Amino acid sequence: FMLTPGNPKWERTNLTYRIRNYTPQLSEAEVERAIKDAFELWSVASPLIFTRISQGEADINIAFYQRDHGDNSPFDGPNGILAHAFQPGQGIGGDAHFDAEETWTNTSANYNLFLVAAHEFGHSLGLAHSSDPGALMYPNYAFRETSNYSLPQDDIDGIQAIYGD
Ligand SMILES: O=C(O)[C@H]1Cc2ccccc2CN1S(=O)(=O)c1ccc(-c2ccccc2)cc1
Ligand SMILES: [Ca+2]
Numbered sequence: 215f216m217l218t219p220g221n222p223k224w225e226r227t228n229l230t231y232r233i234r235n236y237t238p239q240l241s242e243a244e245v246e247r248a249i250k251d252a253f254e255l256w257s258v259a260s261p262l263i264f265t266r267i268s269q270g271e272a273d274i275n276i277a278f279y280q281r282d283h284g285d286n287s288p289f290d291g292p293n294g295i296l297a298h299a300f301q302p303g304q305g306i307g308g309d310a311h312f313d314a315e316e317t318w319t320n321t322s323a324n325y326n327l328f329l330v331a332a333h334e335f336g337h338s339l340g341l342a343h344s345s346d347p348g349a350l351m352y353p354n355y356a357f358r359e360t361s362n363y364s365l366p367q368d369d370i371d372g373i374q375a376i377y378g379d
């Protein structure tokens with residue numbers, strides 16, 4: 215695992231998040247469940263607690279955007295970059311954006327939203343990319359069974375390094 219340069223991290227353990235919009239590819243409940251379970255992966259290996267809010271200012275904004283979307287990191291259409299997130303901090307800090315032009319799924323087909331969201335949240339919490347090819351924080355996407363998914367040991371090591379002892 216690798217911690218993001220500067221070691222940015224949340225100084226509060228209860229964080230809020232808000233799903234700002236949706237993707238036509240899945241139902242709203244499917245998007246909400248993928249996000250909830252993605253946060254839960256990290257939650258069960260750290261002292262962090264995530265609370266969803268329906269409107270208002272949340273610590274972590276989550277949204278689906280296309281191409282230019284106000285942050286100087288434009289998406290690129292189908293495939294290629296799937297999503298991105300900002301390191302812990304105020305404002306844009308911690309926010310996770312997903313490329314609206316992707317085929318988002320809750321299956322083994324590209325691209326499983328739950329898995330991509332889980333990876334992005336690692337960034338939102340302060341983790342950089344791992345060089346362990348089996349880590350959720352590895353730089354390239356790959357499907358893994360999701361029904362009873364749990365964080366690979368390397369990611370546990372990483373989150374414990376930040377929010378542990
Ligand atoms: O890394 C990112 O967040 C973004 C932005 C970025 C910025 C700098 C360098 C590389 C990348 C690559 N991408 S990405 O869209 O191609 C990507 C997204 C998810 C996963 C993944 C890995 C394992 C399991 C499930 C999903 C991998 C890559
Ligand atoms: Ca893309």
Ligand SMILES: [Ca+2]
Nearest residue numbers: 273305306307
């Ligand atoms: Ca934020």
Ligand SMILES: [Zn+2]
Nearest residue numbers: 283285287311
């Ligand atoms: Zn963005």
Ligand SMILES: [Zn+2]
Nearest residue numbers: 333337343353
């Ligand atoms: Zn990444």
